[PDB]
Design a protein around this nucleic acid. Structure first.
Ligand SMILES: C[C@@H]1CCO[C@H]2Cn3cc(C(=O)NCc4ccc(F)cc4F)c(=O)c(O)c3C(=O)N12
Ligand SMILES: C[C@@H]1CCO[C@H]2Cn3cc(C(=O)NCc4ccc(F)cc4F)c(=O)c(O)c3C(=O)N12
Ligand SMILES: [Mg+2]
Ligand SMILES: [Mg+2]
Ligand SMILES: [Mg+2]
Ligand SMILES: [Mg+2]
Ligand SMILES: [N+]
Ligand SMILES: [N+]
Ligand SMILES: [Zn+2]
Ligand SMILES: [Zn+2]
Lengths: 368, 184, 368, 184
DNA sequence: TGCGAAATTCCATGACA
DNA sequence: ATTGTCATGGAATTTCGCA
DNA sequence: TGCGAAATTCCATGACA
DNA sequence: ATTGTCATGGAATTTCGCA
């Protein structure tokens, strides 16, 4: 108010206000002659309201807010007062987009053995075929070997029936899935516990995390499409064909088919590899164990130039998953509790629940 | 000659009629010759059709060079022959009234019938749900002749379900008495 | 057949077949002992069928198809016969994804004057507000100045009513729009002809092309969202507020608001710029003409390392716009008739119609 | 003193009653003082409400420092005063029975009434649709005093609709005779 | 001990809602 | 309490056939 | 003729279905 | 017969205030 600005008018120096400029009174207001013209110096007690009025015209960010203010006013360190308000504006914080990229992806170790980890997922709905609409896809992490089950719904109940059939063969240590209703039900949890199977869950709304199976989904749909060209979409009877076709397709980077990785020898399918015809099975399994440990594994790519990586205590915001029309795309700020890895965190929302989330569904809250 | 391998030969046979379970009456039994690995499929009948239907499931996972069977009707029909020819599978039959496989397969088949009988007492009607557990038991069962289970021989790894108990498989005096009550 | 391969068995050299290897007969088939093992050399007359059988197992590409064939066979220049079949396989051609990026975007010249070019578009549907569901957005290309009209449908009829109101002010040389039904109707065409307005159309399914307005859509929805936080979505009464708010917001790269670019002087809105208070209007308009010609203009970014740019006569394929479930994502190959610019082409489809399309909705047909 | 500018002052007035057109009876007329730029708005009545409604449209495009009017009820109501105060618009009234603007505005308003009358003959009921074309005519009309049209003065460019014909604006003997038939 | 061509490996691109 | 993936087909690089 | 801090400019990021 | 755009907020760079 009055105080600070009074000493200025009589010609005494105040820190912040450069001395080489002529400060004066006119129309009952303190003014100054700056290169760009003559501006009003409002009293500090008025400044917050001004920044706010300017910001609120269209809820603009730093520079567009400054440009408005500078039209009429000058004071020391204007942007600091602008940034202060941006950091407290709930509407801007939850609505604006982020302009910092996630840090580079992890390439998790390939499971060591077949049956160490299954990845499961649904595809659908699809055009009805024999009364069926969905496909349960099961991908063994180590081998890529895949099982396909037609279903009527992406239900727990259908999942259980299909996996009872599959686990006839072998029981996996782990089953990884997204947070679909089928997989997160208590009925499914009991079914896993009963068999000593650990359920691992993707952070929510982050299909990258089920990448092994999502990627196989693509191959499945792609081959289905080709086989169905020019015909009606009768996919039911093609599932077994596709399964067999994909489990016996080479991955060019690996030089092995998933069936080869699982069994160490082709069955009686076309163009069966005949290279181990003179080895004993035991010799064959020995070469297989070897092959399995020396497979190509990709590494974390370079960070983009403007990436952020999370830190315990940071204010961050979770992406709203299914935002309504004209509603914010971000939740209110929350706090990073633990950095599980550089791409995964536990946050305390404002409620507050502990939530485990992908960095991809997060932004660092702007302006601290 | 070349060493015996998985998928070289599948031995198939039916078992039943059994008491009904979820509408099913038989089990098609498939044993891999080299590994002893067993696959079981419930059917409503020992027909060519039910055989084709079940083997379609199995052959979408692995196709054998040779299928071996006795001369049951389901297996000697010209349909089943057509089915096999389409998949490049050679069919092979034992001589009538003179069944043959290998010691390994005979032993395995004996185990299957014995393990089954042990379980359809007290619950003659609930065997449908037990087929998964039966197969896991059979496939994680130590082979005296080889040093390895069928699981180990098919996949080249230990299983996450080792059946560490070499089980009784024999009927206890209680099970003998209540099995003579279902018949007599 | 027999011929070619006979001279080989007796020991005479044939071009293609390396001489340092032992070629022979066994089981009634020509064979050879290659480092990887012993392979069958089928007669040329058999080779096409083999490549085809291998390819058809799962409709694999070059290497995955080769890897199957190499299991059993060897012949000279195997990949050439594989690539030959990939180039003739209708199912692979129309189903596979492209792995070549579009060349870098054009940054078209900013229109020289206000009213040279309007960009128009619809937003919606939105939550019903006073019976209204859509917004017609009109963006002047030079200035960014924007007009907003609430409508009940994205109809020609509603478009005409709104533009009759707008053109009261001034008539633009050009109106650019996408291919929505509202804008491509003959009724709308007559309405433009009547006023000497030229209708320019985006290549289809390429909203980049309406970028000026699409980008303003984002600002509109964003400000609407902020204003509606915590309240029901009564957007109707906010349109005028948003319009005014956005037309008076600074673009930080330009240092001007769209209203300033249109009029060369702020109206009586908050924080009006007062810098030309002593100039005559004529002097003011002179500075404006100047400001307008010297605005920042971005340039074409660097090409990505694996871009393709189109060439007259090339086989290319148009992206299916709304592909059904399990149906190919690409049309049959078509031919580039004319390269309008490096990002836009006329193609002759197989029907054949002339179509003008974005390179972004094209892939170069693989394997020539 | 500082040179006159667009948005410095808007002169507003009503015209009517007119014959009905799409349910409308009046035109609110807004003229920018510095440029002579005209905006027309159809209303159902000369009320404060219809004025606020039309000016809301205009003030979502540009806000004047000052609105000038005569002392019509619509403009002197305390509602209209509240409306203006909210937008920081100073209100300014001419003295009763003594209207005043500037030569430019007077001339412009004369043109408006004359251009309108010329068009509501033969089609007294179709003026609603003609308001767009009326405004374009008026705003691309050369100013004898300044060297420039209102369009040119507001936007700093030539228009894509130059009304190259300095038009008759006077009634032809046919239009005079059939205008004395609608009344008498 | 080096050439031209073929084979193999590299890797950006895009798609699994 | 968890984490991207991998077929694809031009281009780049390596290996082959020969001398 | 050069320092520390403030101001301004740069520009990757993401979103307009 | 056509064609991306531009608000945003940290970081990089330039300019200011002073000497
Ligand atoms: C109702 C459940 C629980 C909540 O989430 C939804 C929606 N969802 C979405 C995708 C999806 O967006 N796939 C596209 C994709 C995008 C990027 C990438 F790297 C990999 C990808 F596969 C799925 O795949 C998926 O399975 C689900 C699903 O199951 N649910
Ligand atoms: C029925 C009409 C005719 C046929 O096309 C549809 C669908 N469409 C889609 C988008 C859209 O995808 N916007 C997102 C976007 C994506 C990338 C980018 F660079 C810019 C962007 F705005 C539109 O904006 C749009 O107006 C329409 C529309 O009008 N139509
Ligand atoms: Mg899922
Ligand atoms: Mg998925
Ligand atoms: Mg559109
Ligand atoms: Mg759009
Ligand atoms: N890992
Ligand atoms: N251009
Ligand atoms: Zn805000
Ligand atoms: Zn194909």
């Amino acid at each position: 108010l009055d105080a600070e600005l009074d000493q200025l008018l009589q010609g005494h120096y105040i820190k912040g206000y450069p001395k080489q400029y002529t400060y004066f009174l006119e129309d009952g207001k303190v003014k100054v002659s700056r290169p760009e013209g003559v501006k009003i110096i409002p009293p500090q007690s008025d400044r917050q309201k001004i920044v706010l009025q300017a910001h609120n015209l269209a809820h603009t960010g730093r520079e567009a807010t400054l440009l408005k203010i500078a039209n009429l006013y000058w004071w020391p360190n204007m942007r600091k007062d602008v940034v202060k308000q941006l950091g407290r504006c709930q509407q801007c914080l939850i609505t604006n987009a982020s302009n910092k990229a996630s840090g580079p992806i992890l390439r998790p170790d390939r499971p060591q053995k077949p049956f160490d980890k299954f990845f499961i997922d649904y595809i659908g709905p699809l055009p009805p075929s024999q009364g069926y609409l969905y496909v349960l896809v099961v991908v063994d992490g180590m081998t890529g070997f895949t099982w396909l089950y037609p279903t009527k719904a992406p239900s727990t109940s259908a999942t259980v029936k299909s996996l009872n059939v599959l686990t006839s063969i072998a029981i996996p240590k782990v089953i990884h899935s997204d947070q679909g209703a089928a997989f997160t039900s208590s009925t499914f949890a009991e079914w896993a516990k009963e068999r000593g199977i650990h359920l691992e869950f993707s952070t929510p709304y982050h299909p990258q995390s089920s990448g092994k199976v999502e990627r196989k989904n693509s191959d499945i749909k792609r081959l289905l499409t080709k086989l169905l060209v020019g015909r009606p979409t009768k996919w039911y009877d093609l599932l077994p064909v596709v399964q067999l076709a994909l489990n016996n397709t080479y991955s060019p980077v690996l030089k092995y088919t998933p069936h080869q990785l699982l069994f160490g020898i082709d069955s009686n399918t076309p163009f069966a590899n005949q290279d181990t015809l003179d080895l004993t099975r035991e010799e064959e399994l020995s070469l297989l164990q070897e092959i399995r440990t020396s497979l190509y594994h990709p590494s974390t790519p370079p960070a983009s130039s403007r990436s952020w990586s999370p830190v315990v205590g940071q204010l961050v915001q979770e992406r709203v998953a299914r935002p309504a029309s004209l509603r914010p795309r971000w939740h209110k700020p929350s706090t990073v509790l633990k950095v599980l890895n550089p791409r995964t965190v536990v946050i305390l929302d404002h409620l507050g629940n502990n939530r485990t989330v992908s960095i991809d569904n997060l932004k660092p809250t702007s302006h601290q | 000659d070349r060493p015996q391998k998985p998928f070289d030969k599948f031995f198939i046979d039916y078992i039943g009629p059994l008491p009904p379970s979820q509408g099913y009456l038989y089990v098609l039994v498939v044993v891999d010759g080299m590994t002893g690995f067993t696959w079981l499929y419930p059917t409503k009948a020992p027909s060519t059709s039910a055989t084709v239907k079940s083997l379609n499931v199995l052959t979408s996972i692995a196709i054998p060079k040779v299928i071996h069977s006795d001369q049951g009707a389901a297996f000697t029909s010209s349909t089943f022959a057509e089915w096999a020819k389409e998949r490049g599978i050679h069919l092979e039959f034992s001589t009538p009234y003179h069944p043959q496989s290998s010691g390994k397969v005979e032993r395995k088949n004996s185990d299957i019938k014995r393990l089954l009988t042990k379980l359809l007492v007290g619950r003659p009607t609930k065997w449908y749900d037990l087929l998964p557990v039966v197969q896991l038991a059979l496939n994680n069962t130590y082979s005296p002749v080889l040093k390895y289970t069928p699981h180990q021989l098919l996949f080249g790894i230990d299983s996450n379900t080792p059946f560490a108990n070499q089980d009784t498989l024999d009927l206890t005096r209680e099970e003998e008495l209540s099995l003579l009550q279902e018949i007599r």
